[PDB]
Amino acid sequence: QYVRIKNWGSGEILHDTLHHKATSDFTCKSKSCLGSIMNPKSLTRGPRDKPTPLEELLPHAIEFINQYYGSFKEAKIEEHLARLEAVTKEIETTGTYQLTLDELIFATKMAWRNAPRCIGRIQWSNLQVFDARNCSTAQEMFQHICRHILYATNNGNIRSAITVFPQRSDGKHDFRLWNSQLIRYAGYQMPDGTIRGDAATLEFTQLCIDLGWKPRYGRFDVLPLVLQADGQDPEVFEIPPDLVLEVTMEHPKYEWFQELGLKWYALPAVANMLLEVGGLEFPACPFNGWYMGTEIGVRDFCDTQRYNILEEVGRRMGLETHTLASLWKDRAVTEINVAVLHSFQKQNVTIMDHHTASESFMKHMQNEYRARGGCPADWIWLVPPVSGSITPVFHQEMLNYVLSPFYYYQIEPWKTHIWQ
Amino acid sequence: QYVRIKNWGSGEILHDTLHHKATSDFTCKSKSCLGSIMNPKSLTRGPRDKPTPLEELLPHAIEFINQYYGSFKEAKIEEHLARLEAVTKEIETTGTYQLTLDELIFATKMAWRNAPRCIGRIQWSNLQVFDARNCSTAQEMFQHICRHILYATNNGNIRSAITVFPQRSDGKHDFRLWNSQLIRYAGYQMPDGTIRGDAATLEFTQLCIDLGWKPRYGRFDVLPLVLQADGQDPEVFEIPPDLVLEVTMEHPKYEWFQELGLKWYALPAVANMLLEVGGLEFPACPFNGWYMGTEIGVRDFCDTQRYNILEEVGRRMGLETHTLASLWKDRAVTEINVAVLHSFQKQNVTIMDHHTASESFMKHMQNEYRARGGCPADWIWLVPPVSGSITPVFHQEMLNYVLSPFYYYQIEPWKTHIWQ
Ligand code: HEM
Ligand code: HEM
Ligand SMILES: C[C@H](O)[C@H](O)[C@H]1CNc2nc(N)[nH]c(=O)c2N1
Ligand SMILES: C[C@H](O)[C@H](O)[C@H]1CNc2nc(N)[nH]c(=O)c2N1
């Protein structure tokens, strides 16, 4: 009927009626490249009630196994056949099937390798996999998560890793982390009308409060891990402060910068994503990489929907804040960016600047193209929020497409969960 | 078979074989959002041999006329009917038809209003139209172009305008400007292996040289207007230097900046685009707006494929050029940007900074959505090459789609022209 278009800044929504009057075929699509959309139904893998139908599951499984065994330099045909046989049988026996460890590993790397929105993909071969498939309780999830957060952090020398929880069974016994990302500050709507902390985590914070969380009312309060096992409702577990490594922000020239009382966690771990592989899907499998400066300096600190520090950092620099054309914003942000990179380097916490990051991705694309003849890339995401064309990936044409295995988005669990 | 992907920086080309292994349907498209592609066959309107078939032309014409007359606040039904009648008749009489002046005007504004890649669209109602449809010689084109360039420039107080040449007849009597844009510097590949001027205009410069152009071998040599009328071959006309208004670059603090010997033309006029409207198509109709700082400061001056000044402007600032992570690039560019904005403001030449530009577009989108229920927007193009997320349009979801009337791209005339 119409398309819902949201402006992530004002949160305002618009209804596009015009697209119906489109000509014929546009680029690969007919009447609209909705590539600009954040959460398209196409990048999401929702709920269930019934298991994955055998006729579908079987081929998908066979496909994935052909991918796996076709991988190794010198194919183990017998084992390839043997595995195909063993899987077909196991599928027609249980209704689902289990992956060998080396399969999940290969899976997870390929899924990452197939994530069109990730720029750190040149690191695809170096990934740690925590097999939590045999897990069964919320408490057990928590213990696994802590181990991950521990291993990942490694005292600043951040390590990429993913902890895969139990796969999907029927569709009502799902393990799901309700948080956006492993570590994430809270946002509270204060009495005097203002907002404190991360305004993005406002709705989620209230949820934590509703599940009886102790609101510490601050600017950098690490939110609690909201876990749900095998269908069972979400149990709230607080992350051990000793596990949350942070970096306090300080500029190499502007000493008044640390007076801002800014800091940010060192661990970027995406929590709420689903892993599809060979017909199987793991709705709980948090992964982490390492920060890329611009994420914190530009997005986290300078967005209106986030901490929104730009006005202040601009003022303390003595810039013409009431004159857009003075490019004070361009000046401030860059300094905030240097602050972050500096503060991370100083406190020996792994981080990469967007330029070095883009240059390594371009190299990756070449390796990827020469290797498998392609590389799914979402330009909109791959190009940094600042210094776009000063970066190589801006002048690079890309093809955005969904392969498999793949890391899909999911429906926020609190909207579709049946309470008990 | 495969898709050609070019990297506009190195000019290197890649062949994507992988997309064939795509899942099902992606966003609006099945196996690929090629929204990142520069010149998709979908945004191009190529050659011909035979006129526009009556069965197609007629409906399209009827459609456009329903759009036009449905426009005015209080419809002139009788004239609406009368015009529909007069057009149908005129079409079935000649094989093509002519638009009333007020129709071309309305057309041109709507076409602009429908350009998904333009950010200056809030100015759609203020546009000047030069009716050169009765033109017939290369020399006459030239005179019309000069008048345009004159009116547009207006001594720095730049005015948006478009000069529409003769529509398409059969498909072998086309009026086409071979230049990229009205005013544009030349690029020569010098003896010592280097490149001087705009490296982007290397192939076109050689063409001008082949058509006997006097190579002034410099960094800012305004290229000659290569015109072609009614099929006839391209006649080379040089633009009267008194018409080309330029702005010499100078920084408000760094006095060594003007020592760079930099400057740029004040007139942004797109030359090589085709105008489709009601089945009719005008392969020659140069239009112009006014510069948006970032175009010159970031694209023209800092691209590797262009003037490539970043290394130098960085060095003279005394920055750690051999250390990507020092964000010297971010620092330099911003200063170059201030230089441009400053130099234009100082010499009283209309220009707009990207922030003020984004804020006016967002306003436009709201006006557009409330008015007609939509606004074709190409995020990739609308978001500035620097300070992406510091701009409102970055956090704005858009729908990219081809409506009508519309400004399509064309095939570079020297590839498809039959010489005589
Ligand atoms: C080695 C370090 C890595 C770097 C520098 C890196 C960097 C990035 C960046 C900058 C983004 C965009 C984040 C945003 O704007 O929200 C991103 C997204 C993403 N990355 Fe990575 N990444 C790394 C490792 C990983 C790993 C190890 C995985 C998974 C195994 C991964 C999976 C993804 C996915 C699926 C997204 C999409 C996020 C979303 O859709 O919200 N990344 N990455
Ligand atoms: C009022 C001032 C205007 C401003 C500030 C403006 C600005 C812009 C900018 C920044 C671009 C991108 C240029 C590039 O990156 O190559 C653009 C593209 C475009 N604009 Fe405008 N514009 C203005 C007026 C116009 C007018 C008057 C027309 C036509 C009647 C127009 C038609 C278009 C079209 C078709 C494109 C696409 C260019 C391409 O595909 O290469 N613009 N505009
Ligand atoms: C509306 C628009 O798609 C959205 O704001 C985008 C654009 N590009 C992005 N790219 C990255 N890396 N991260 C993001 O959140 C976004 N958001
Ligand atoms: C490959 C990529 O599509 C290309 O470099 C783009 C991106 N966005 C752009 N946007 C604008 N305004 N101008 C451009 O030339 C480009 N080029």
Side-chain angles (χ1 to χ4, degrees):
Chain A
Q1 186 197 336
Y2 76 65
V3 183
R4 199 175 197 79
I5 271 184
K6 180 184 180 179
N7 169 272
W8 294 97
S10 67
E12 180 183 291
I13 296 185
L14 294 174
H15 308 125
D16 192 288
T17 318
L18 252 184
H19 70 110
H20 290 130
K21 305 177 184 169
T23 308
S24 298
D25 297 338
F26 189 38
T27 319
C28 195
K29 172 63 336 200
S30 302
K31 66 176 183 178
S32 240
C33 188
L34 328 160
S36 165
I37 295 301
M38 278 256 249
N39 308 297
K41 279 188 182 180
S42 56
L43 245 48
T44 300
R45 184 58 71 89
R48 271 211 222 247
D49 264 345
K50 308 175 169 57
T52 312
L54 285 291
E55 58 273 19
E56 299 181 45
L57 202 168
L58 187 39
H60 282 332
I62 310 305
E63 152 70 321
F64 171 72
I65 302 169
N66 270 260
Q67 182 178 11
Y68 177 98
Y69 282 94
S71 175
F72 216 113
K73 196 203 171 185
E74 39 214 6
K76 312 159 190 175
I77 326 160
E78 40 282 284
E79 299 176 41
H80 179 173
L81 286 22
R83 185 66 185 139
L84 270 163
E85 154 82 271
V87 177
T88 306
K89 184 173 302 178
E90 183 175 1
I91 302 177
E92 62 187 14
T93 305
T94 351
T96 212
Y97 73 114
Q98 300 298 332
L99 287 156
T100 72
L101 190 74
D102 203 19
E103 280 173 353
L104 224 204
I105 281 178
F106 161 94
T108 49
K109 293 179 180 176
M110 290 302 304
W112 177 17
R113 199 173 171 171
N114 299 346
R117 299 179 159 183
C118 182
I119 204 167
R121 283 181 288 175
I122 191 173
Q123 289 285 326
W124 73 270
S125 66
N126 311 126
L127 172 67
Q128 194 55 45
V129 192
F130 293 132
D131 195 347
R133 280 179 297 174
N134 50 46
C135 175
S136 54
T137 27
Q139 187 77 45
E140 277 188 294
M141 272 199 276
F142 184 37
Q143 289 160 8
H144 273 115
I145 299 184
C146 293
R147 166 172 161 81
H148 186 196
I149 295 180
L150 184 58
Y151 170 97
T153 305
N154 197 40
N155 213 212
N157 191 216
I158 309 296
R159 293 177 291 183
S160 295
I162 180 177
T163 184
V164 184
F165 284 97
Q167 60 190 58
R168 198 171 225 139
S169 56
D170 68 310
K172 199 165 181 177
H173 290 339
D174 294 326
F175 288 65
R176 290 282 295 296
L177 304 81
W178 291 29
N179 312 69
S180 291
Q181 35 196 303
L182 254 34
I183 299 176
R184 182 80 178 275
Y185 303 126
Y188 323 100
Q189 176 162 115
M190 302 216 101
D192 41 280
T194 64
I195 294 179
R196 211 132 78 91
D198 192 343
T201 64
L202 269 167
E203 187 180 295
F204 183 83
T205 285
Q206 187 73 348
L207 189 62
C208 292
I209 299 301
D210 293 350
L211 308 183
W213 179 62
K214 307 311 297 174
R216 255 163 183 85
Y217 295 105
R219 293 175 308 153
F220 295 103
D221 301 335
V222 175
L223 285 159
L225 233 32
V226 174
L227 279 40
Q228 75 149 49
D230 216 68
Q232 275 71 70
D233 287 1
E235 285 178 62
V236 186
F237 301 76
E238 195 182 301
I239 320 178
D242 294 296
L243 291 175
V244 186
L245 166 61
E246 303 182 282
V247 172
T248 44
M249 297 308 150
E250 69 180 69
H251 196 300
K253 253 78 177 182
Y254 306 47
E255 297 184 15
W256 56 263
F257 197 75
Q258 63 169 256
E259 287 179 21
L260 281 51
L262 261 35
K263 62 169 184 174
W264 198 261
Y265 43 97
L267 197 66
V270 188
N272 64 185
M273 287 197 118
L274 185 158
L275 170 52
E276 174 275 308
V277 55
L280 300 167
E281 43 186 61
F282 307 80
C285 61
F287 51 84
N288 81 300
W290 50 73
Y291 263 109
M292 185 220 244
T294 44
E295 292 184 78
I296 304 175
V298 195
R299 312 291 277 112
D300 301 326
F301 285 161
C302 305
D303 268 29
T304 304
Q305 55 269 57
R306 306 300 289 292
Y307 285 77
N308 195 0
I309 70 174
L310 206 53
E311 164 90 53
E312 201 178 353
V313 191
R315 277 179 167 163
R316 289 176 176 250
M317 286 186 69
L319 308 164
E320 303 159 81
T321 299
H322 310 286
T323 310
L324 258 319
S326 67
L327 302 205
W328 62 271
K329 294 192 181 178
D330 303 65
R331 286 184 157 127
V333 189
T334 293
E335 296 314 319
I336 298 179
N337 272 319
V338 197
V340 172
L341 270 64
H342 179 242
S343 298
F344 269 69
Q345 294 170 347
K346 192 166 195 163
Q347 303 174 45
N348 298 287
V349 180
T350 307
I351 198 172
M352 185 169 261
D353 68 275
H354 53 315
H355 300 281
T356 301
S358 292
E359 298 197 336
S360 62
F361 179 71
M362 294 283 78
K363 175 68 179 179
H364 172 57
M365 210 168 167
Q366 295 158 33
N367 299 316
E368 196 76 324
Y369 267 70
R370 188 175 179 290
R372 52 191 196 145
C375 178
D378 186 327
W379 193 95
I380 296 203
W381 280 57
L382 296 164
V383 180
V386 295
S387 297
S389 58
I390 303 306
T391 266
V393 307
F394 177 102
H395 311 112
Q396 175 62 70
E397 293 180 321
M398 297 150 178
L399 249 56
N400 197 3
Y401 51 89
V402 175
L403 299 182
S404 187
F406 193 88
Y407 291 114
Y408 292 73
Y409 278 80
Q410 299 194 66
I411 306 248
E412 298 189 318
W414 52 95
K415 296 179 179 294
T416 63
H417 177 75
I418 301 179
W419 283 85
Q420 57 223 242
Chain B
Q1 186 197 336
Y2 76 65
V3 183
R4 199 175 197 79
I5 271 184
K6 180 184 180 179
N7 169 272
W8 294 97
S10 67
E12 180 183 291
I13 296 185
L14 294 174
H15 308 125
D16 192 288
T17 318
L18 252 184
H19 70 110
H20 290 130
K21 305 177 184 169
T23 308
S24 298
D25 297 338
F26 189 38
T27 319
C28 195
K29 172 63 336 200
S30 302
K31 66 176 183 178
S32 240
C33 188
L34 328 160
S36 165
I37 295 301
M38 278 256 249
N39 308 297
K41 279 188 182 180
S42 56
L43 245 48
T44 300
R45 184 58 71 89
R48 271 211 222 247
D49 264 345
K50 308 175 169 57
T52 312
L54 285 291
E55 58 273 19
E56 299 181 45
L57 202 168
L58 187 39
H60 282 332
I62 310 305
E63 152 70 321
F64 171 72
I65 302 169
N66 270 260
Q67 182 178 11
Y68 177 98
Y69 282 94
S71 175
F72 216 113
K73 196 203 171 185
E74 39 214 6
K76 312 159 190 175
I77 326 160
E78 40 282 284
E79 299 176 41
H80 179 173
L81 286 22
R83 185 66 185 139
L84 270 163
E85 154 82 271
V87 177
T88 306
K89 184 173 302 178
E90 183 175 1
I91 302 177
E92 62 187 14
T93 305
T94 351
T96 212
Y97 73 114
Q98 300 298 332
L99 287 156
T100 72
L101 190 74
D102 203 19
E103 280 173 353
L104 224 204
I105 281 178
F106 161 94
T108 49
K109 293 179 180 176
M110 290 302 304
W112 177 17
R113 199 173 171 171
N114 299 346
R117 299 179 159 183
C118 182
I119 204 167
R121 283 181 288 175
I122 191 173
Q123 289 285 326
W124 73 270
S125 66
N126 311 126
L127 172 67
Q128 194 55 45
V129 192
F130 293 132
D131 195 347
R133 280 179 297 174
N134 50 46
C135 175
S136 54
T137 27
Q139 187 77 45
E140 277 188 294
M141 272 199 276
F142 184 37
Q143 289 160 8
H144 273 115
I145 299 184
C146 293
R147 166 172 161 81
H148 186 196
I149 295 180
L150 184 58
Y151 170 97
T153 305
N154 197 40
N155 213 212
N157 191 216
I158 309 296
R159 293 177 291 183
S160 295
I162 180 177
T163 184
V164 184
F165 284 97
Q167 60 190 58
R168 198 171 225 139
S169 56
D170 68 310
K172 199 165 181 177
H173 290 339
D174 294 326
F175 288 65
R176 290 282 295 296
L177 304 81
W178 291 29
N179 312 69
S180 291
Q181 35 196 303
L182 254 34
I183 299 176
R184 182 80 178 275
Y185 303 126
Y188 323 100
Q189 176 162 115
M190 302 216 101
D192 41 280
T194 64
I195 294 179
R196 211 132 78 91
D198 192 343
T201 64
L202 269 167
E203 187 180 295
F204 183 83
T205 285
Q206 187 73 348
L207 189 62
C208 292
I209 299 301
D210 293 350
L211 308 183
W213 179 62
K214 307 311 297 174
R216 255 163 183 85
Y217 295 105
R219 293 175 308 153
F220 295 103
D221 301 335
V222 175
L223 285 159
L225 233 32
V226 174
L227 279 40
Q228 75 149 49
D230 216 68
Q232 275 71 70
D233 287 1
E235 285 178 62
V236 186
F237 301 76
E238 195 182 301
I239 320 178
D242 294 296
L243 291 175
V244 186
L245 166 61
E246 303 182 282
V247 172
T248 44
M249 297 308 150
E250 69 180 69
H251 196 300
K253 253 78 177 182
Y254 306 47
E255 297 184 15
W256 56 263
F257 197 75
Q258 63 169 256
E259 287 179 21
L260 281 51
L262 261 35
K263 62 169 184 174
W264 198 261
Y265 43 97
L267 197 66
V270 188
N272 64 185
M273 287 197 118
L274 185 158
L275 170 52
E276 174 275 308
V277 55
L280 300 167
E281 43 186 61
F282 307 80
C285 61
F287 51 84
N288 81 300
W290 50 73
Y291 263 109
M292 185 220 244
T294 44
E295 292 184 78
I296 304 175
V298 195
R299 312 291 277 112
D300 301 326
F301 285 161
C302 305
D303 268 29
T304 304
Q305 55 269 57
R306 306 300 289 292
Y307 285 77
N308 195 0
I309 70 174
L310 206 53
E311 164 90 53
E312 201 178 353
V313 191
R315 277 179 167 163
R316 289 176 176 250
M317 286 186 69
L319 308 164
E320 303 159 81
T321 299
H322 310 286
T323 310
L324 258 319
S326 67
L327 302 205
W328 62 271
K329 294 192 181 178
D330 303 65
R331 286 184 157 127
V333 189
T334 293
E335 296 314 319
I336 298 179
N337 272 319
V338 197
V340 172
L341 270 64
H342 179 242
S343 298
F344 269 69
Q345 294 170 347
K346 192 166 195 163
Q347 303 174 45
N348 298 287
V349 180
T350 307
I351 198 172
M352 185 169 261
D353 68 275
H354 53 315
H355 300 281
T356 301
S358 292
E359 298 197 336
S360 62
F361 179 71
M362 294 283 78
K363 175 68 179 179
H364 172 57
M365 210 168 167
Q366 295 158 33
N367 299 316
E368 196 76 324
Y369 267 70
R370 188 175 179 290
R372 52 191 196 145
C375 178
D378 186 327
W379 193 95
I380 296 203
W381 280 57
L382 296 164
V383 180
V386 295
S387 297
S389 58
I390 303 306
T391 266
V393 307
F394 177 102
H395 311 112
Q396 175 62 70
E397 293 180 321
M398 297 150 178
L399 249 56
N400 197 3
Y401 51 89
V402 175
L403 299 182
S404 187
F406 193 88
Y407 291 114
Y408 292 73
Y409 278 80
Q410 299 194 66
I411 306 248
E412 298 189 318
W414 52 95
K415 296 179 179 294
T416 63
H417 177 75
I418 301 179
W419 283 85
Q420 57 223 242

